[PDB]
Amino acid sequence: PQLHNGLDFSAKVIQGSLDSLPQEVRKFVEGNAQLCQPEYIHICDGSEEEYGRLLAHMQEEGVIRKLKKYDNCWLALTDPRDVARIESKTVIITQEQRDTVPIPKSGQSQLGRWMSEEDFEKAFNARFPGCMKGRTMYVIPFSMGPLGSPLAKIGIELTDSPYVVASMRIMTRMGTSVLEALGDGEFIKCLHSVGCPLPLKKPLVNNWACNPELTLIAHLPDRREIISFGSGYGGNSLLGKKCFALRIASRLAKEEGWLAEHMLILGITNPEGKKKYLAAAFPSACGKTNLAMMNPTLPGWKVECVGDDIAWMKFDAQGNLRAINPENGFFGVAPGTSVKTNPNAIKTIQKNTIFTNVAETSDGGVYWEGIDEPLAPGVTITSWKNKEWRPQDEEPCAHPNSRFCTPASQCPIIDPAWESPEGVPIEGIIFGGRRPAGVPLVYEALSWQHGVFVGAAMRSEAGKVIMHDPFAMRPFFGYNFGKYLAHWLSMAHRPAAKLPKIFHVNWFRKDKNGKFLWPGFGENSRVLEWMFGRIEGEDSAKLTPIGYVPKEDALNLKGLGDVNVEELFGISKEFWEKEVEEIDKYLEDQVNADLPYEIERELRALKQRISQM
Template sequence: MTESLPSNVRTFIDLAKEVCNPDNIFIFDGTQKSYADICAKLVSSGALMPINSYLYPNSFLARSNPVDVARSEDRTFVCLPDGEKLYKLKPSEIPPTLGFTWGCRSSEIDAATGAEMTTEQMRAHMFKLFKNCMRGRTMYIIPFSMSPINSEFAKLGIQISDSAYVVANMYIMTRTGNGVLNKIKEGSPYIPCWHSVGCPLEPGEKDVAWPCRLLAKDRYITHFSQPDPDHKSFGNYSVMSYGSGYGGNAIIGKKCIALRIASKMARDDKVKWMAEHMLILHVTHTPCIGVDEKTKKKQYGPNESYTITAAFPSACGKTNLAMLEVPLEYRDQWHVSCVGDDIAWIRIDEQGRLCAVNPESGFFGVAPGTSDKTNRNAMETLRAGNSLFTNVGVTLDGDVWWDGKSDDPPAKIVNWRGNLMEESQYKDADADQEKKKKKAFIGQVAHANSRYTTPCSQCPIIDTQWNTGKGYPIDAMLFGGRRTKLMPLCIRASTWEQGVLSAATLRSEGTAAVSDRVMGALSFDPMAMRPFIGYNYGQYFQHWLDIGELAPKKPDIYTVNWFRKSDDGKFLWEGFSQNFRIVQWACLNARRKRIQGVIKEVEKDVTITPLGVAPLPNALMIDIKNAEQKKILADPQILTVDPKSSGLGNDWYQELSERKEYLSLYADDLPKKLVDEFNSLVDRFVEAGLAVPDGKTAQSLKL
């Protein structure tokens, strides 16, 4: 069967066969028939369950092992070439109160010596784990491309896996099949990708629906960026993932290749580029230029095109923004379309602009919170079918359900662990008790990190050019996290360097997308890339600064926060479709920049804060008293930066102090420009009247 493969791929597969010792080999050709066969096999084994085909045609439900439900950050390793360090400060030396850990580890500890393994020792350790790991199983060979196969952006890979579930997800999330093999035959390089659930079967042993290693310490997601000395023909890069079947750990094309490996490539390639954890949104503005005197109809000018990218940690509304629904009051002049919801590969074009493409072909979205109210376009994408749901609840008539899909859960539902749940479990004569029980009931239906995998092509607002491989010139970059206190709705950085600092010090409250994260705990997440940076963190920041030097027409950088709450716990911002107002403000700023060369501030629209330029209510059409025409009601507190504020969660001195402590972790890896930029930030807060606690000084905040 492998004789038809390109010779250099066959060399890899021959090695994989020798090491993994599978019973069978299957080359996935990327056809719809092969995908259907894979799904049928998963159904017959009990790994997938068909759901209601009337509601979701050709769609299935998977239930993972309860220990394998999220990315395993603590078991993710970035093994760099000799002489390179992912970080200098050991994870154990970071104060636990700071709310920061390195997103990946540089190596495993050798049990015999107590020392960190070298890169080649780590590789040898992985080969030892893979020895005979597929005994009793089928080895699937998955040729894949990140980005359209014929695009100049395309990066090709060959993934081996003993998980048919992974094959099905790769079919949706990447371009798979014979087209990739043809490009490799023509001379295009590829990245060898190893994956195994790590559960060989003995003769006669019955398999389980979701095989995986049950102990976290037995899972490894390992990235290499130097050649294997024993197999140099495979190139500089490879990935070896062992022990987990969960998407972020096992769908290697996604986070492993498209971010960790790609970010290293982007820095090291002769022509510099970027691989970022960003959505891509295309915005079209058709401005009204007047009203026809005779017909009284509005007249419109030519279309103006804008592209927004935005980076958020997982489960912070990134997909909702990527599939943004323009509020009704703006639809006569504004239209948005989705290019991608998670990853952007960014290159500098001949005009000096940063241009982005989406390297994926599917959405791997967080289900909880997704509904027709919050993201109708995502729901329409799912209703088109051809989707996989993982760890959601299912009703007795085959509908799927999760927290937030509707106001009330179904009367009877089978939860993500396969247990029947009924509304009688939370009904109570005491209304307060019933409310508490109902909340707990809902939380058990679907896992908080339950997912859907669905094709981009089905999205009702997918951009017509999304799959061409051509880059979209970026007009604005948004960075945001989940902050219930302190951070304003929106800030535009005055300079690229100021924007890089704000993105590098991004903080967010923890979500369920990571297995070891405390829900609600505040953590630093630089550029929303903390778990995905594939080389030294300080050098990654320097690369951002370098790109700013190389791209004369670089976009403006914004920080946003949809999640700020009042003292009584109520959200200050409606969010969802109303987030378009910030997108519109960024586009209009870009328009002024195109016409004037710079953004000339309009006094009634903005105010200057220590963090940067903040919009005033007028700029976003916010009215604090009466909503009329295109205005909405909002608390003006959502826009404020008050250096004099104090109190738990609202103390700018404390915030700056924690940012300093965090930046100090990078030691001399931190670029001097960011040191200077942070010290300037402190100066601006002092000038604005920063409240300094007794016994403290503002100067002590400086790096």
């Protein structure tokens, strides 16, 4: 219905048809077209043709550069004001603040950022009206998880950024098949704008549209909406990556009885032909992607990658914890990636990959700190700021959190079940962070409840600062962390639930000279071997106040020899007395009235065990 001609946007559709869309999808698209006033509407089909044409268009406009040395690889350099996920501008809107974060006892909550509905309404009206003027609104239908998986969820992202379209094609399952699978079902509404309507009011920097002053990444779980404005970058703009995958999904999981977690999933096979799947939650910069595609050093062992960042997990009727990787690609940190630290990533990213904010070599290759690769004489480097750069300079050639964006199907060790709609059965969950002192290489939680406490007590080095990052989810909780703990704990009362063993690792313990005690990377297969046997029930553990650690000689150290096991597994009363005190202060303040009894009990129990050593 229409008294004039400003409500039907059919005349502006340059690919697809509004009449083809499911009724509620059409209302989403047309309502925001009316608000944002795009010049064109492009309904993405996900085809190779649309993808290649969009890439070529971005190339002609200077938005991306083709990397000549590789096969269909591309480089985007951003406005340096728009280089990362920005927590201070990431908010969750609920009626009551207590649904989004626990009310802290004394301090400010660091477990989330709540915004009232009225405040968001003002912010929204100050940003989105007319924000796509002169631009194409792309409609991205995408599936989080294998199409038709019982654990998959569907989203529709509206964006004015072709960079987002290309990246979402890699990181999600995108296109016409998703719309047909959606039918009249439920979907998450995702609205994104870089916030630079034409004609441009402010200078465009590095051909990268963004609006840093007005950047705001909002989540409305009760409306099943994600609304992001002002950033074109990564987790701010690829709304499946963190906004859907963790923040919205963790609320859905709370309501529906499953788990959405900042975890890799890997499958490990031992020399006896036995295969187990493990999940691991490490904070950013703590090596999930290295572990997920590890090249094991132990002969006869094999590791295969299901996902490197996000896990959606649900106990099935048989009681197995079944996990899917809801992503379709890897959005990995580039700096530090080398043949030594991640050879399988190096193989994956040389075709069909989009790089953002890395350096470019004069022969059309990529470069970054820690690449640990020499360049032939004559080869020169352009920094991520589009300036000539030489290794004898201070500033980095690549942004510290520059990324590659690569299809998961290309990983040479992608797991054969990485797209299985039923998911893979998780037998162990690993927590870990950067702890230069005090925390052993590996230990095993004494019970599910103790394991949940271990996840809750996770800390990690940021002068050095040791921060709290419970479950590696501190930036990503979609709801009250205290209820999230209760949700985890409630899994132990499920029907026939086969609870995975929980472990905590530390690759980063250092000696008094600051050298790593453990070589890490592929040598972490030796730690996975110990976990593997522990899941099988092997008698390879000794009890300590913090949990089980490997017996003397239980860890396979053949081929190392120069490793200080006593210091690596040293457990100091002095350190752990201070550690439990800090955990106690943290949980009391930050979780306060929503701290489950079982977690307080595990804290008291650990305090008591440490007091007796």
